[PDB]
């Protein structure tokens, strides 16, 4: 039942033809401007060549209206729990001294923990002073030492990619139909361009947009749903805020690789002579992930997840005002067949009247060859053009009317002679 919604005329300046062996081919190379269709409609493009039989259509089907967010700065975070490793060493024994535990670097590995090796994970080396004597396990009155080699590890099973949205991009998932018969599905947002087999297409004039989105962050979960956090984006990591330990990929979070950034001094150590408890006080991202998960009501828009590609999107309740720019980047097209006869039928007439969407018509064309069906009314104000293939197919496009009770006899012709055709249907008042 849903069909075409926009039908304009193509200029002959950017369209040429050439006859090479009783088969005249077309060559499209120019820029065209067509109106974007509504939600759940199409956008055909009637084309005429240098002859009287070539008829190629360029239909653009619109799936729905998506309000995605443009990314810029992102990072991978997650929960981590370190493991404290202690090894008390007496004084005057190997490296047990009073000057090696105080001025100890956080990147040099002592001889007590050098058996592990040069690891590629997040770790640190701390030297804590401990009392000596016979009361703690020593034979000298000099203070002993406590070598600490605590490394960060991951205790969770997944990861989260906390990002932000600097500007909401109004995208439109379009299903481009080629001239030969191939079907391609792309998407156009704000002013992005997509390359096709017949050239390129991009979004022109826009209207739907949301300003001021830097004060809200989103959380993406590979495989699970999305989320939103009511706080600005975290740039510099610091304590007392969500975003202490970060990374750059999923492997850097699931394995706690040393390629990620973290805040200085995050492992709280509790020295107890021989015992050791190195823990952190980082904010669990799963708590906020399960607290502010989609769907979430923000302002006047319903934030939800995507259905095609990956990325956070949004649902709007306003109108659709956009323009599509068609560009032909030197495409070759041919039409071997011609114009033959064929019978048509009626299916259904839906849509509205005196609105932008118009009225969608359903026609059942049954022919035996490859061509195009041409139809028109009586006064010559409305023209209907539809393809005709070998078999029974259902086609249709927009039809403008100024009456809710449409009842006008049409005259269709597959090659030259006209045939009677009566259509009917009840429309609704909508803009």
């Amino acid at each position: 039942d849903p069909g075409c919604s926009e039908l304009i005329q193509a200029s002959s300046r950017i369209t040429t033809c050439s006859t090479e062996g009783v088969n005249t081919k077309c060559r499209l190379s120019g820029t065209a401007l067509i109106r974007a269709g509504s939600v759940g409609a199409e956008a055909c493009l009637m084309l005429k060549g240098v002859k009287e039989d070539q008829t190629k259509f360029l239909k653009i089907k619109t799936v729905s209206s998506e309000l995605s967010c443009r990314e810029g700065q992102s990072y991978w975070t997650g929960s981590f729990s370190p493991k404290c490793l202690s090894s008390r060493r007496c004084h005057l024994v190997g490296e047990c001294h009073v000057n090696r535990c105080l001025s100890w670097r956080d990147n040099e590995t002592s001889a007590e923990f050098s058996f592990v090796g040069e690891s590629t994970t997040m770790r640190e080396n701390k030297c804590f002073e401990q009392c000596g004597g016979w009361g703690c396990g020593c034979f000298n009155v000099n203070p002993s030492c406590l070598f600490v080699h605590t490394y960060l590890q991951s205790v969770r099973k997944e990861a989260l990619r906390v990002f932000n949205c600097i500007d909401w991009v109004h995208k439109l998932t379009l299903e481009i139909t080629d001239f030969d018969g191939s079907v391609s599905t792309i998407d156009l947002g704000a002013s992005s361009s997509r390359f096709t087999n017949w050239g390129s297409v991009s979004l022109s004039l826009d209207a739907e947009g949301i300003s001021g989105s830097n004060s809200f962050s989103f959380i993406e979960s590979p495989g699970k749903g999305y989320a939103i956090v009511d706080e600005p984006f975290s740039e510099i990591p610091r304590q007392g805020f969500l975003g202490e330990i970060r990374c750059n990929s999923e492997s850097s979070v699931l394995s706690a690789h040393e390629s990620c950034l973290r805040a200085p001094n995050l492992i709280s150590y509790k020295p107890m002579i021989d015992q050791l408890e190195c823990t952190t006080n980082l904010i669990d991202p799963f708590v906020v992930f399960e607290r502010g998960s989609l769907p979430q009501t923000r302002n006047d828009k319903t934030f939800a997840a995507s259905k095609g590609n990956r990325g956070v999107q949004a649902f709007s309740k306003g109108s659709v005002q956009a323009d599509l720019t068609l560009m032909f980047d030197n495409f070759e097209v041919d039409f071997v067949g011609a114009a033959v006869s064929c019978d048509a039928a009626f299916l259904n007439l839906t849509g509205c009247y005196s609105c932008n969407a118009g009225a969608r018509v359903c026609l059942s064309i049954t022919s035996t060859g490859t061509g195009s069906l041409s139809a028109h009314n009586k006064d010559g104000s409305l023209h209907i053009v539809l393809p005709s293939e070998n078999g029974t197919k259902d086609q249709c496009q927009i039809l403008h009317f100024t009456v809710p009770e449409v009842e006008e006899e049409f005259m269709y012709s597959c090659d030259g002679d006209e045939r009677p055709l009566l259509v009917k249907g009840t429309l609704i008042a909508i803009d």
Binding site: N197, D329, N330, F331, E332
Partner: protein, 301 residues
Amino acid sequence: EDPHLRNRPGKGHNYIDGMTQEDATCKPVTYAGACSSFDVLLEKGKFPLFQSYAHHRTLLEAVHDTIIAKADPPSCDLQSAHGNPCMKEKLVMKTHCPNDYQSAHYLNNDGKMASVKCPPKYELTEDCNFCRQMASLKKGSYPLQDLFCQSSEDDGSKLKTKMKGVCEVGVQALKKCDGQLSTAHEVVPFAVFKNSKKVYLDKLDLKTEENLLPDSFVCFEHKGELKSFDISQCPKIGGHGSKKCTGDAAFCSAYECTAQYANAYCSHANGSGIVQIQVSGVWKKPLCVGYERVVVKRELS
């Protein structure tokens, strides 16, 4: 890691009608194989694509494996200027001809395998078009293009070069260009399928699919220069029979390792398997994608 790029999986034969001097040291191609047609393939700063795809076949190896057919005649002459079916495609090309060489093989348009030959002791020129007079002359040929080979039997002969915006690019002439145009000498990617023509492409989208295949595991003879050995004689998983064979981690995980009972040590190929390409928006398995510096005519009017 694991410099085992010298071993040739499968047959690995680099022989052609004409170069009968390297016949004794050409079939097969082991670690101690000496030949100018294969030594220049592993040289640095000349063939980067072959170094990226080291665990793959070549042109002659694909011909001996009943993958690439031979032309007629497969070896032409560049001495007398009486005319031969080879200059029509050689004149439009522009490849460098190293010194001390007599033959130069490349890929033709018909998907077969055409080559030239210089009569002794006259060598080739700097461009490889003609032949001039004569250090020591080599006993092999020189690959003019930068292509490879693999085991593939995918069908695809009913195709055509779909490159919009250009006129007569490469050898296939889509349409004439007598008005405004701009020609040069650039490179254009192409791929030849089974019994097809040289279909040129715009962008290259290769993808190597790693899988536990016998063509992705090298192996040499174990003893107390290393010699190659047939890897297809090894047993499967959970078996200890026939010709024993051992390996490291990949070969031991895929097959078995009999340790002392094995007579040949196997290994893993540093990047090998099934290579795909994105032609006409459809995933297809080609034979050997290569580059060449030919005449590229574009469109401006």
